[PDB]
């Protein structure tokens, strides 16, 4: 959580504060006149040392999920929370939909070098793919049968993984294994509990947050 917060805090300081006062006296002695220095120094904080260390943290976090059995419901909830905070590091910041962002020609969007976040998201997805059906089975089972908080976080994790899964491998697994049908069929069980929440003095709102997480995940699947 604090790693996700520190990376997001670095990204919010704009680059105008490294240009006033004290290193300008030692580099004036290599005279080579050739070519304008005008693009290569803009991105050197987050990107040159981070990728390998983050991929190791992801692998180890996925392995720690697989080592936890069905008895460790609170541990699982923390690990799904950790994985959601990790997946938030690779998230592109919401660019404002300015009228000028549409002046960027379709040509500049096809020839722009791949953004560092899209590289990290792809490399993270290749790591999820290396754990195969074992990780898919654990997350899908905890989304259907888990404890209230575990179900919510597993559904939020599925919403996030399916949002980045361009090959639709997780969607194909969820359909072919029947978990997508179990999640849909359980809406009839939620109906009985959701009716009780409309009373002036409702029970604990846990069923509402499970329903919201389930419907958010189904809404995500419906976008393809």
């Amino acid at each position: 959580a604090h790693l996700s917060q520190s990376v997001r805090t670095e990204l919010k300081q704009p680059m105008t504060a490294s240009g006033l006062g004290q290193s300008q006296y030692v580099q004036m002695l290599d005279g080579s006149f050739a070519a304008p220095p005008g693009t290569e120094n803009i991105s050197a904080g987050f990107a040159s040392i981070g990728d390998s260390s983050l991929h190791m943290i992801l692998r180890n976090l996925l392995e720690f999920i697989l080592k936890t059995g069905g008895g460790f419901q609170r541990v699982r909830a923390h690990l799904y929370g950790s994985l959601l905070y990790y997946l938030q590091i690779a998230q592109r910041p919401d660019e404002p939909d300015t009228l000028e962002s549409a002046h960027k020609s379709m040509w500049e969007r096809l020839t722009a070098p791949e953004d560092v976040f899209s590289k990290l998201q792809r490399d993270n997805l290749s790591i999820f793919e290396s754990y195969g059906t074992a990780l898919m089975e654990v997350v899908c089972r905890d989304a259907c049968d888990g404890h209230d908080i575990g179900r919510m976080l597993a559904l939020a994790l599925l919403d996030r993984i399916v949002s980045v899964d361009r090959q639709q491998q997780w969607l194909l697994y969820l359909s072919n294994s029947g978990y997508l049908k179990v999640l849909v069929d359980s809406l009839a069980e939620d109906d009985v509990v959701l009716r009780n929440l409309l009373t002036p003095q409702p029970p604990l709102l846990k069923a509402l947050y499970i329903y919201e997480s389930k419907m958010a995940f189904l809404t995500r699947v419906a976008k393809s």
């Binding site: 089975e137 089972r141 259907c144 294994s177 978990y179 179990v182 069929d185």
Partner: peptide, 12 residues
């Protein structure tokens, strides 16, 4: 009994 959840379990 440990392996399947929701709609997949019903079909099984």
């Amino acid at each position: 009994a440990e392996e399947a959840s929701g709609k997949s379990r019903k079909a099984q």
